[PDB]
Symmetry: D2
Subunit: 350 residues, 4 copies
């Protein structure tokens, strides 16, 4: 009997994780927010009959990480063996203007879910996965970063996720809950939110190729990231819960690239060579072959306290879990641009 | 200077109101929830460039009715002349299992918005519209229901909206805020949420017509409602803020029909005549011409405390605003079925 | 098995209710807020040094309410906990909504979560503030509600969420629609205790003058010791019904001031009008009462007078203490207190 | 212009800080919770240049109204659910007040347009060291919290750092170690011991129960530590500092030294929850152990290194452990003899 409860099931990771666990024969339950319109686009294919919306081995429940009673009711009805806490306000720029909501969902909501496990009498039966993050390293104190690199958060998102990391450790130590922190670095896919930098670039490049757009604006072009594929990373979350002891792990590729490089490589897939001119907020990217400007900079996309550089060392996970990433940067860029060209050609309003 | 701020801009009513105010020359601002997917499908045609998603006279801001600082920041930046508080968890059945979240958004959230107006120094310069509701009458104490009919709520949604009604009256009386309660009766459209009874029926009948669904289940077939068209009702909201004095008004058709009638008329639009057999949870609806059962009853769609009957008396609004409804019940049903058949032919999952 | 859980046990009513249920042999549990100082002065005398147990909690913390209810398994719950001051509710509107409105829902949801919906009896502390603007005099159960403060609006939410749990789930839950009740343990910020304490300081030479707000407001004032018995009676009833509890007599604040001063040998004579009105002692010539606009409310509740016929008929309840006797008892107690400790 | 706003003015530290600032000629404003009873006992003697305002660290509108009306030059955020044992049963409330409440106050400063004119003090804590990663602990020792209180205070520490770095707010974390006084809350171990010992001396009590006798702490005096808070805001640059005595003693030693001041020598017998403390001179048992006073995850050992504060602020403690014990026992004897129910 394998019964999983996923908070954040409608998100990028929750959609891939649901597919992965269904293939292994799990009964999969998800918590979905009430919405005035459709919000299940990433998972609508996982109904027994998607046309008629008839559920099979995936069951959805209305709820929210800010409603204490709804979490107790769902956990008591489902009695899960595994809980994956993926639900969050996950956008770092948005966290600067929505700091209080971000604290309530990403920080206090982690405690609410842990308290619901305890209220339901499941502290000694459930295994709990927390969605921790390389944003905890912020202004990095070591390069590369690994499990024993000290934390230095740099946004209201990072501060909220730091609370969540430590409240999970305290339940593990105080009550012997099997609970783990996955310290995941950036991971993307064709299902990535449109407001994250990689998907923003692939969508915009697609629209330019098709004549639906002339130019778009970015923020800090010199930021450097470790980018993997979400489909690979959800496997690591499951492996952490199969481990004999509840241990925390970094999950990453170890390879670093700039935003500028993501832009350059994306445009090469549509036959265009970007050459940069200007400085600071006045920098632009121009196509060599046509002379047209396609990329500009706008300070509205900068963050007040930036995270300049991330590079993860996942040696501990490779040794203990036998996890390895499959998709590297060049393949990720290609896949994202190709998927967005097909999407935008089929539907220009997408 | 005509500058509107709409909470709940992504919802049914917010989408039609945004269009109406833009046609009258307003600068229109909306508060939008952060979502992991797009949630702006009802208003994406109101960008200056819809393929490129570039804003014109409509401007969107991230926020939530539970985040105090965001509301003050938006109101202080925008300095609106009119505020329409349409944001809510609006589903009555869902409110029984999300009672606490519904109280915080629909009840306390109204107070947060009023307090933001006061904090920003705008108590003498803004006009405020509250989205009140015929659910306040609940177990109806008069037939028909008018502004002076006593309230008798019958759900956590109704109780939260009752708090909101009275906190608005108290700001009007204490501080001379121009604030009004629109006591609107049920209003529908092709943009109505899928989980409301009218849109559930029109979508299900469309799928049956396309041979993609055999049967669907409803709850209480004998519930009676006053149903109008959302496009007509957003005009009344605007008229209530054009009034010289702040007054509360009932907005309704005055005509009553059952859920069962909505079902029968919907099926006639696809060439089928429904004849009913049996009682209570064992009642079924069978097509006379083919012999096939297309409608069953499931107790899971019933509410613990039902609102059996609503019929609005809009005499005061006809006399003081010169408002009248344009769309009647028969036309509403025809429009919703025709729209959903056309939609279902392109996408069987709608 | 008689096991009561009282939210608001440290307050005026909770202290008298605790005594009442203890005298009848109940096991009494209370929810107490964490404080940086001592906050249990009204109930310290009820320790074994026994049958009263205290638990740390808050009406805004969901998990604590479930933990307490699951451990205690009460047969009766009295939700007396609240930010209960009407003037303060205008400056603390959001906190007042969260505690007095949503907190009632949290407690009802805790009962449901703990599986006690069919076993517990639930008393809600409802209020005559729900009759904020009135055309019917006296007011009874069928008089319409019209709140006039953020306190009143929060209490109206609480009244109706209680009704919805009764109707939806067949919970035995009742609204006590209680009119003003006072005592020597009444909070000092309420008008009656403000007057008695100030009159007593003036008597002992500790104070010369004090200021009030609206002198012409009219109220139905009873004694808290009488009203807590009515709460228990409502839970012993065969069916869950809502009741008005009141004296039926109405007096002004001006009247309360005049009578209080008569108990210290002084005859109050008023001069001027509105915010510049003062009360002077006739036999000495000294000004002892002024008016300050800062003590007015933006939206006043002008007049309250309750008809408790339903309660007299179904519960056999009647009030024992009247306005004149209450004034005498409060002024007498504060005179003792200020003589025995001028810092009390 | 010198105008202070103190959250937590009714608590131990707020009462000493109010006195200190008033003696320097500050206008002092405080935020007080509505209570059904009197809650201003520590500051009632200061009734002028002190003004009190009703509020709560969970009510956003009240914080903006107060900050906009007062326009303080200095804010001290001392308000908190501050009891570590209670935090295990009130984890959600503790997060909302101690964690989120710090963000609400910072956001109010920003909303009111005061980022460049206010200096902000945050009440951080040696509980951040939890399971100590070094001995003694200094500003660079890694944090490892061990309760819902400690986790909430960790969020508060880092949201303060983020406002400093993002917006150039003059904001600082005082990383203060345990500090006590005759006004210390009765539920903390030092005041529990001094009150119980005073009652035993006067024949008003026979015996009391404690939890973990072998926990070790660095204990100073609150009057000295509020001075350090003010010095951190007079500094030219906004820096974080450890404030401590550098001396460590056990709960067991606090018990023994307290009883010596009333003429009794405690000798211990038995083990774990069956351990008792007996007076050698009389043979009478006065101390027992009850597991109900233990914490699920204990903080075993705290000892602070305040070299940075000595070098940059010229701060030093005036009172050490032995004088603190003497002062607390003598004050509680005088209190209990003057009023048996105090
Ligand atoms: N590179 C990465 O992607 C990365 C790396 C490390 C950690 N993380 C963290 O890993 C998790 C999954 O990332 P993702 O990319 O899949 O994020 P995502 O696409 O933004 O998905 C977030 C999910 O959380 C849900 N959610 C938001 N607020 C909620 C609330 N109040 N109550 C309940 N559910 C709520 C969202 O629902 P709606 O669809 O209704 O908005 C959505 O299902 C997040 O916690 C994220 O912070 C991500
Ligand atoms: N018959 C009727 O339609 C009727 C009659 C009387 C009164 N009402 C009331 O009138 C209003 C409009 O009705 P409708 O049919 O347009 O409702 P709807 O389609 O359900 O729209 C609700 C809107 O509120 C937003 N919202 C929900 N929770 C929010 C939060 N926490 N913060 C900010 N925004 C939030 C939703 O955003 P998402 O898109 O992100 O979910 C959406 O924009 C509602 O208040 C409803 O209760 C409706
Ligand atoms: N005339 C009347 O007295 C009258 C008439 C009708 C209705 N009522 C209502 O009846 C009830 C009792 O009145 P009263 O005069 O006894 O009021 P009170 O003296 O002001 O007592 C209020 C009680 O509620 C507690 N409380 C406040 N906030 C709380 C929170 N967030 N969580 C948990 N407990 C909290 C208080 O604790 P602290 O001691 O820590 O502050 C205190 O125990 C109240 O609900 C009041 O609104 C009173
Ligand atoms: N050894 C130490 O003493 C030490 C060491 C490091 C850090 N700290 C921290 O330093 C600060 C002061 O310590 P202390 O010993 O003076 O604490 P305390 O005696 O417990 O005082 C706490 C203060 O905060 C107030 N408060 C509690 N909840 C509140 C809320 N929701 N809204 C507004 N105010 C609220 C309390 O009011 P009431 O009086 O109404 O309860 C009281 O005034 C605290 O933040 C504490 O955690 C203490
Ligand atoms: N979104 C965005 N980022 C931009 C832009 N221009 C430059 N950037 C820079 O590109 C980098 C990546 O930004 P995001 O794609 O938004 O991701 P993130 O901030 O690293 O956060 C993501 O990864 C975290 C793990 O490190 C996750 O915790 C988080 O939830 C999120 O998925 C940042 O340094 C950002 O400033 C732009 O127009 N948009
Ligand atoms: N949703 C739904 N309702 C059903 C079903 N079967 C029967 N009904 C009945 O159909 C009636 C209408 O339900 P809804 O369409 O969900 O609307 P509502 O509960 O009346 O609430 C709507 O109108 C209110 C004004 O009266 C609004 O306040 C509210 O937000 C919402 O828009 C109710 O009596 C309901 O029990 C079913 O399967 N689904
Ligand atoms: N407190 C106060 N009230 C004053 C003053 N001067 C005049 N009043 C007037 O005296 C009347 C009584 O005020 P309170 O004693 O504060 O009581 P209340 O507002 O009637 O509220 C109490 O009774 C309600 C039931 O009617 C309760 O619901 C509520 O919790 C509270 O106990 C009000 O009309 C108030 O304006 C003054 O200086 N202080
Ligand atoms: N309170 C208490 N503590 C006891 C008892 N018996 C033993 N102790 C032990 O005595 C030690 C001190 O406990 P407290 O006096 O409660 O203080 P604290 O947990 O160290 O917390 C105080 O200091 C922190 C700084 O380190 C502050 O952050 C916190 O707010 C509080 O003031 C702890 O190890 C505790 O387990 C008892 O009966 N009561």
């Amino acid at each position: 009997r394998n019964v999983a409860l996923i908070t954040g099931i409608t998100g990028q990771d929750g959609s891939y994780l649901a597919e992965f666990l269904l293939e292994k024969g799990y009964e999969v339950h998800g918590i979905v927010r009430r919405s005035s319109s459709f919000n299940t686009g990433r998972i609508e294919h996982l109904y027994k009959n998607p046309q008629a919306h008839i559920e099979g081995n995936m069951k959805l429940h209305y709820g929210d990480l800010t409603d204490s009673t709804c979490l107790v009711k769902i956990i008591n009805e489902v009695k899960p063996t595994e809980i994956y806490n993926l639900g969050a306000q996950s956008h770092v720029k948005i966290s600067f203007d929505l700091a209080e909501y971000t604290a309530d969902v990403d920080g206090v909501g982690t405690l609410r879910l842990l308290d619901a496990v305890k209220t339901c009498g499941l502290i000694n039966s459930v295994k709990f996965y927390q969605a921790s993050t390389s944003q905890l390293y912020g202004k990095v104190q070591e390069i590369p970063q690994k499990e024993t690199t000290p934390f230095y958060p740099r946004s209201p998102y990072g501060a909220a996720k730091l609370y969540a990391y430590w409240i999970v450790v305290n339940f593990r130590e105080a009550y012997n809950l099997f609970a783990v922190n996955g310290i995941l670095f950036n991971h993307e896919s064709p299902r990535r939110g449109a407001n994250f930098v990689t998907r923003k670039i692939s969508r915009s490049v697609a629209k330019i190729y098709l004549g639906q757009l002339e130019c778009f604006s970015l923020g800090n072009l010199d930021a450097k990231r470790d980018w993997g594929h979400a489909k690979d990373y959800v496997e690591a979350m499951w492996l952490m819960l199969q481990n004999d002891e509840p241990e925390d792990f970094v999950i990453a590729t170890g390879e670093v690239h700039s935003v500028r490089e993501f832009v350059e490589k994306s445009f090469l897939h549509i036959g265009k060579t970007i050459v940069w001119e200007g400085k600071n907020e006045n920098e632009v990217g121009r196509c060599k072959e046509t002379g047209k400007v396609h990329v500009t900079v706008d300070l509205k996309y900068y963050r007040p306290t930036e995270v300049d550089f991330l590079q993860g060392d996942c040696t501990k996970a490779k040794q203990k879990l036998n996890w390895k990433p499959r998709v590297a940067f060049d393949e990720l860029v290609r896949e994202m641009v190709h998927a967005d060209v097909e999407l935008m050609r089929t539907n220009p309003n997408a």
